[PDB]
Symmetry: C2
Amino acid sequence: ADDRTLLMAGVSHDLRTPLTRIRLATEMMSEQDGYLAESINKDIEECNAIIEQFIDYLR
Amino acid sequence: ADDRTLLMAGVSHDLRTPLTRIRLATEMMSEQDGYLAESINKDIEECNAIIEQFIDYLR
C-alpha cells in the first residue's frame, strides 16, 4: 500500500540523465580507449540492472 | 514504519560498485580526453546527489 515502487521508478527516471551523459561522453573517447568506453557502458548497464533488481523485489 | 530508507541505502550501496568501476576506467583515459573524464566523474557525483535527494525526502 506504500510508495516504494514509485520511489524506485523515480530513482531510475532521475539517474537516467547523468547516466546518459556518461554514455555520450564515451562516444567522444579516443579509439585507443575503446575498451574503456566499453567498460564504462557495461557499468551503466549494471547500474540499470541493479535498479531492476530492486524493482523486481517490490513486484 | 517502513523500509524505504533501508531500500535507498541498499541502492546507494549496490550502485557504488559499478560507479566506482566507471571512475577507475576514467583514470586510464588519454590525457587528451581529460575533460571527458572530468565530465563522467561530475555525472557520477550527480548520481550520488540524486540518491542523497531521495534519502533526504525520507528523513
